[model samples]
Target: HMKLLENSSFEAINSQLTVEDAHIIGRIESYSCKPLSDKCSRKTLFYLIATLNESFRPDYDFSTARSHEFSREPSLSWVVNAVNCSLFSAVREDFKDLKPQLWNAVDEEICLAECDIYSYNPDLDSDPFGEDGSLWSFNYFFYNKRLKRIVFFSCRS
Candidate 1:
């Protein structure tokens, strides 16, 4: 998780009544400011989640690959949506813009892959114990043949 941060970067902030003033623009690589502001961070989280899911597929044999063979689709989705919502909100106050996009499904997928090109350091932390905190919950479900050959899933359904 990110440690203490200096929550004062209002200096470079430029907010005027311009068209660019409403498109949710951000630095994509800020230091201690809003992590979501960094598009690279969003990509990194998405990649990791996808990789995890591919690596952790219960039926898939990971003898050829390292780590668990599974997919992290759900986790990555939450992170991306969170970032988009957050940074976009910061740029617009009352949603009074002619906007160019409105969460287009194809656009979102394209953008999601594009984030991979930006890149960011991996950060493994997300819980009530994390900064900004979270009351969210996640459950992993699968048949654990070793545990009972029936059910040995995780957290919830």
Candidate 2:
């Protein structure tokens, strides 16, 4: 629980979530602040904003453009993926406790944004990111749901 004393620019979001709509964004944000792995694949977890088991590389800010043009909502989808991106990290110890449902929701929102922002259920998951696997030293599909808290990697260097 983040206690903001009055007239504060910041509000700490701490959630422990039963309801789906409430502050998933804040929950994901706090999770992203931990120190993550230094390895190319695992270390990039925070930036990718994905599950540690899923390898990802989303280079553009789809959420912003979409929100401006349509969607008309703040997206946890982008935050989850972006937070786990290549440049940052999360706590290794807490990695085991992180949840997947929260992330999957983020992915769903992102896919919706890509399908034309305001357009509902365009099913963009079929071609998520659409990046060529051959170009990267490695390419992996994280949303396959193959990762279910197996904890393949962590913030440990």
Candidate 3:
């Protein structure tokens, strides 16, 4: 069983719109779930991504999106890379966009050895950032059944 714990949205700044008019965009959703079966299929992961994409970007249709899995041999290194890439992409000439607190929290979580970590990318025509010229996008899923938690991290640039 999977139960949503929290779904928090971080709105992006829209230059043309008023401060209050900006849309709630990026999100971090956490869930509590029983351990997945040994034979968790690709289709199961695809549907999970579909559900998340729908909630994350309701305006975009993801029926045709293709899901590609990443190798888990390096364990949680991919999660670190995804977060670092997102942080770097978010940096600008004037702003450093440092996220040390976020990095530390994720680092601590990945330290556990019993987790089932999965990384996948869903190819979509529309940008979740609500901007053009995105070079890449990815979704990282970390499931620690012993902790009864599953955290989904989605990043794009």
Candidate 4:
């Protein structure tokens, strides 16, 4: 039910999933740029929860999420840590065991290499940096389904 693009790099990722994988079981999040001087990137955290109400479909809202702050780092590196990890812990709460699955889905080992080279070419004043630690965007998506009820979260910073 997963169509992941590994080793292969692209400017954008295609997210086309069916109901079979509709429920937001896990989360996918990223950060554009962080100051190199900052090493406690692990301090950064955020959480988004979706729930059902008195309706057919559950309410999926990521806007009302919670977050922790960090004061930049000496650039950023993609890391895969435990569910209780200080880094991306909020996004890994549900799937504490499937770290491999979650990481394979978002291949930063190689994909980010290309991203390190390309600037995503946009006229926007705030854009990605070339060498390291520049302007970029951070985002994540989550979907969880329990039969007819489903919860989704898509957020960015």
Candidate 5:
């Protein structure tokens, strides 16, 4: 009687790599869900982030992460800029391979009109992803209730 979301794919790939060789790399993961009756609640959102965090960094605990919610819907330009900052900062070596995909994914996959976004910053001591001494880190979620999807972008340097 129950089934996984239509576009759900739990497989991991290099394309989803967020940290490598002690550097925070930019990557995006999109997940599908069943359409919701209303906007995703903060409780549901935090739980979703917690779940993804576990898979992304199994060695670290998610309780150490600090999160912030946008007061209003973020503009596409703002999202693009935030992503570019993360993409160019630490993933410089892989600019060619990673740039286009990150840009295109944000542009084509996300539907901002019906989306709510949030950001998470892991505590320094937590050493999430084993990338300590990182100058900065970013974990952003763009959840679209209408599309029944979530697009997660993360990177650090």
Candidate 6:
């Protein structure tokens, strides 16, 4: 179970998009934010979701090399960072040359990642990433069973 968040902005996201199979208690690793408009800066959230799936479930035993070799394929901390960084950098670069761009703020990669997802649990105070006052629902969450400990991503706005 999760705590209830105040002043939820989830209705806005739900009205615009479709998210499925989300979980509770996710570990956010890092994110990048840039100014898009005079007042609204795009804030991205990068995190991981832990659930019952064996292939990407965080509880999988990886004590032995064989148990973790292939598991590293797409289930490791490094993989998460790699994917996150790549998307962040690419989006920034791709939009660097946009002439006469309405908002100097590009896509604000906070909502970008290899696998960005939201929790579907409606019992909580708000949607997966909807509760934080400083944070917006425009975010991304990934899944990595190889995470050994709890850590959150550093935000640079």
lDDT of 2 by residue, 29-92 (tens): 2112233445655333232333311222244333222212212225535534544542123323
Q: Estimate, for each residue in 58-118, the C-alpha lDDT of model 3 and write its tens digit.
A: 6655555554434342556666666665546544331243355444454454434667777
- Top-scoring candidate (TM-score): 5
Q: Runs in model 3 with CA error above 4 Å? A: 7-25, 34-73, 92-98, 107-113, 123-132
What's the residue-level lDDT of 152 in candidate 2? 14
Give one digit per residue, the lDDT tens place, for model 4 in 1-157.
1122232222122221111223322233332222223454622222122221111123332223333311222222422222224324333453344444544544433342222211112223332222433222322322211111111112211
For candidate 1, the C-alpha RMSD (Å) to the true structure equals: 17.2
Q: Name the runs in model 5 displaced over 4 angstroms.
A: 1-24, 34-43, 63-73, 93-97, 123-131
Residue 88 lDDT (model 5)? 67
TM-score for each model: 0.23, 0.20, 0.56, 0.23, 0.61, 0.18
Error of 4 at 51 (Å): 26
lDDT of 3 at 145: 52
Q: Give lDDT tens digits, candidate 5, residues 33-54.
A: 5434456565555545554654
lDDT of each: 0.29, 0.27, 0.51, 0.26, 0.56, 0.26
Among all candidates shown, the one with the greatest lDDT: 5
Write the residue-wise lDDT of candidate 6 on 1-157 in tens digits. Answer: 1111221233232222222243221223322222234453412211122221212235332122121111213344454454345334423553233211311111122222333333212223323224444221212233222321212221211
Model 6: how far is 121 from its true place, Å? Answer: 8.7
Displacement of residue 93 (Cα, Å) in model 6 is: 9.2
Q: Report residue 138 deviation for candidate 5 (angstroms).
A: 0.5
| CA RMSD, predictions in order | 17.2, 18.1, 6.0, 17.4, 5.2, 17.2
Residue 140 of model 6 has an lDDT of 27
